[PDB]
C-alpha cells in the first residue's frame with residue numbers, strides 16, 4: 492500500500508515535527524517507498540506538518556552548475572564562457588544528485604530561491620524571503636548565508652533515510668572553525684544581473700574537504716565523520732517516515748558539536 496499524505500503527517504508528528512517548526516529535509520526517496528501521488532505526497536505532508544507558520548529550507552543547487560568546468564581557473568574557459576546558460580532562479584532546475592525531492596520543492600507555488608547558483612537554497616513559508624536573501628558568491632555556506640540564518644532561527648534537520656554525509660548545515664562549521672590549512676577553491680558562476688549574463692569569479696571554502704585528509708574521494712569527509720560521532724553520542728528523535736528511517740536533529744546543536752570536533756583535532 493502506497494503511503495498516503497495523512498499517514499506521513501502523523502509519522503512526522505510522532506517524530507517531533509511541530510506546527511511552526513523551521514525544517515531542513517534530506518530525503519532518500521528510495522528508502523521512503525511508494526507514495527500516493529509520487530514525491531509530491533511527501534512535500535504536501537511536510538508543508539502540512541510544519542503548518543502555515545512554519546518554514547521549509549532545502550539545498551537544491553543547480554543541475555547545470557559549471558563548477559567542475561571553472562574550478563581552479565582565474566576566469567571561465569572560453570568555450571564555457573560563450574555558451575553556458577546564466578543562472579535563472581525561476582527556471583533553473585535543481586541538482587538531482589542532492590535528492591529528487593528538491594525539484595518538487597523548488598516548483599512549489601510561493602517557493603523562493605536563493606541567488607547563489609552553485610549553493611542554491613529554496614524556502615517555503617512566511618520567513619522564506621528572509622531566509623534566501625542575501626546569498627552572495629564567496630559566502631556559500633558560511634556566515635551571512637541562508638544556512639546561518641537557518642541556524643539562528645532554531646532550525647531542525649530532518650533526515651529521511653539519508654546518510655550522515657548529507658548534513659549540508661555542517662559546512663557552516665567548516666567555514667567558521669579556527670583551524671590551520673583550510674582548503675579554498677576558486678570557481679566562476681554565470682549570474683543574471685539587470686537582464687544580462689555576467690560571469691563572476693570567487694573563492695570560498697572547499698565544500699568537498701576542508702582539509703586534505705577529508706578531501707579524499709573514497710573518502711569520508713569531515714561532515715560524515717562529525718555526523719557519525721554526533722549520532723553515536725546524542726539522544727536524537729528517531730522513527731519511520733514512510734518506509735525510511737528518519738532522525739530529527741537540532742541544527743544549532745550539531746553545528747556547535749562540529750566546531751568543537753574540528754577545533755579539538757586541528758591546532759589553530
Ligand SMILES: NC[C@H]1O[C@H](O[C@H]2[C@H](O)[C@@H](O[C@H]3O[C@H](CO)[C@@H](O)[C@H](N)[C@H]3O)[C@H](N)C[C@@H]2N)[C@H](N)[C@@H](O)[C@@H]1O
Pocket residue numbers: 552556558559609610656657698699700710711712714715
Ligand atoms: N566530498 C565528499 C562529499 O561529496 C558530495 O557532497 C558535497 C558536494 O560534492 C558539494 O558539491 C560541489 O561539488 C560537486 C563536485 O565537484 C559539484 O558537482 C557541485 N555542483 C558543487 O556544489 C556540496 N556543495 C557539498 C556536499 N557535501 C557527496 N554528495 C557526499 O556524499 C560526499 O560526502
Ligand SMILES: [Mg+2]
Pocket residue numbers: 544617618
Ligand atoms: Mg514565523
